[PDB]
């Protein structure tokens, strides 16, 4: 990774200009700014606990390199290769007027995200903050898992971290297990199918994971929730992705499939 000076990063972002269209958005623990180097567009995340998360991000990126993981370019502030299509969260909501993702693109993105998580778990890493805001999309809409500041290389902690609407029950109690990442990925799969955010305070139900119970109790069907901003979805593949999401969202962690099984199920879907 390249060691950048703070004044270099200050200059490439127009003194960290907070106005939107150098401000691109708000990342996990700071603001993300658009920058340039040698004609390459980059993303600059300007951030004791925070220093440890900065170090963890560098350490995990040093060990983990995969097509479905973001690429860290350097640090001072963390510098990444700019992902032209932003986050899956924003593309699902069509933020800034971007066109809705097709069912075909959604399947590829789901497969890519699972391949990324599989790579992290094979390398004995638990992400701990799997969510659609942490799935970035490059120039070809390839899914890239981001934000390894909370990553860790059964087991409990006193500092419970993560995003509540995506968290497994045992993660909310303090457990650290790769099974919690599977549960969070199940919520992401529901966001892909429905186009709905994981939590909406002005919606009933507020939490997206609650639709699993509505479908099981036959109060609603998966068809009632399928994103209407698609013209190419088919019941068979949608139902197969919902079946993976349902398995991931099992309340008992040991009943959930491992990431290799999730990856297999998503491959058989297409
Ligand atoms: C209409 N059109 C306008 C421009 C737009 N757009 C492109 C982008 N690119 C973009 N955004 C990011 N962050 C946000 C999602 C903005 C919050 C990041 C990012 O956070 N990291 C990152 C941070 N920490 C750890 N690992 C990776 C790396 C790359 C990256 N790249 C944003 N918006 C697309 C739609």
From Swiss-Prot:
From-to range in the entire protein, with total length: 165 to 458 of 460
GO biological process, one term: Toll signaling pathway
GO CC annotations, alphabetized: cell surface; cytoplasm; cytosol; endosome membrane; extracellular space; extrinsic component of plasma membrane; nucleus; plasma membrane
Name of this protein: Interleukin-1 receptor-associated kinase 4
Signal peptide: none
Modified residues (Phosphothreonine): 154, 157
EC number(s) reported in the record: 2.7.11.1
All copies of domain Protein kinase, residue ranges: 22-266
Similarity-based family: Belongs to the protein kinase superfamily. TKL Ser/Thr protein kinase family. Pelle subfamily.
Function (record text): Serine/threonine-protein kinase that plays a critical role in initiating innate immune response against foreign pathogens. Involved in Toll-like receptor (TLR) and IL-1R signaling pathways. Is rapidly recruited by MYD88 to the receptor-signaling complex upon TLR activation to form the Myddosome together with IRAK2. Phosphorylates initially IRAK1, thus stimulating the kinase activity and intensive autophosphorylation of IRAK1. Phosphorylates E3 ubiquitin ligases Pellino proteins (PELI1, PELI2 and PELI3) to promote pellino-mediated polyubiquitination of IRAK1.
Catalyzed reactions per annotation: L-seryl-[protein] + ATP = O-phospho-L-seryl-[protein] + ADP + H(+); L-threonyl-[protein] + ATP = O-phospho-L-threonyl-[protein] + ADP + H(+)
Cofactor: Mg(2+)
Disulfide bonds: none
Residue numbers of Phosphoserine PTMs: 158
Location (main, coarse): cytoplasm
Active site location: 129 (proton acceptor)
Subunit structure: Associates with MYD88 and IRAK2 to form a ternary complex called the Myddosome. Once phosphorylated, IRAK4 dissociates from the receptor complex and then associates with the TNF receptor-associated factor 6 (TRAF6), IRAK1, and PELI1; this intermediate complex is required for subsequent NF-kappa-B activation. Direct binding of SMAD6 to PELI1 prevents complex formation and hence negatively regulates IL1R-TLR signaling and eventually NF-kappa-B-mediated gene expression. Interacts with IL1RL1. Interacts (when phosphorylated) with IRAK1. May interact (when phosphorylated) with IRAK3.
Keywords from the named record: Acetylation, ATP-binding, Cytoplasm, Disease variant, Immunity, Innate immunity, Kinase, Magnesium, Nucleotide-binding, Phosphoprotein, Serine/threonine-protein kinase, Transferase
Binding-site list for ATP: 24-32, 45, 131-134, 147
Post-translational modification summary for this protein: Phosphorylated.
MF-aspect GO terms: ATP binding; interleukin-1 receptor binding; kinase activity; magnesium ion binding; protein kinase binding; protein serine kinase activity; protein serine/threonine kinase activity
Source organism of this protein record: Homo sapiens
């Amino acid at each position: 990774f390249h060691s950048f000076s703070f004044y270099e990063l200050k200059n490439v972002t127009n003194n960290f200009d907070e106005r939107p269209i150098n401000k691109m958005g708000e990342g996990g623990f700071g603001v993300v700014y658009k920058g340039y180097v040698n004609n390459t567009t980059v993303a600059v995340k300007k951030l004791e606990e925070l220093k440890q998360q900065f170090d963890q991000e560098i350490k995990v990126m040093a060990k983990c390199q995969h097509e479905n993981l973001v690429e860290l370019l350097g640090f001072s502030c963390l510098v990444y290769v700019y992902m032209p299509n932003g986050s899956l969260l924003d593309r699902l909501s069509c933020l800034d007027g971007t066109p809705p993702l097709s069912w075909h693109m959604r399947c590829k993105i789901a497969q890519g995200a699972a391949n990324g998580i599989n790579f992290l778990h094979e390398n004995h890493h638990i992400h701990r903050d799997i969510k659609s805001a942490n799935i970035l999309l490059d120039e070809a809409f390839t899914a890239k898992i981001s934000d390894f500041g909370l990553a860790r290389a059964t087991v409990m902690t006193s500092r419970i971290v993560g995003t509540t609407a995506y968290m497994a029950p045992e993660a909310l109690r303090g457990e650290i297990t790769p099974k919690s990442d599977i549960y969070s990925f199940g919520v992401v799969l529901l966001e892909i199918i429905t186009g709905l955010p994981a939590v909406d305070e002005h919606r009933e139900p507020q939490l997206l994971l609650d639709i699993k119970e509505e479908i099981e109790d036959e109060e609603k069907t998966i068809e009632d929730y399928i994103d209407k901003k698609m013209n190419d979805a088919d019941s068979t593949s949608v139902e197969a992705m919902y079946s993976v999401a349902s398995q991931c969202l099992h309340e008992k962690k040991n009943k959930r499939p491992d990431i290799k099984k999730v990856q297999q199920l998503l491959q058989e879907m297409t």
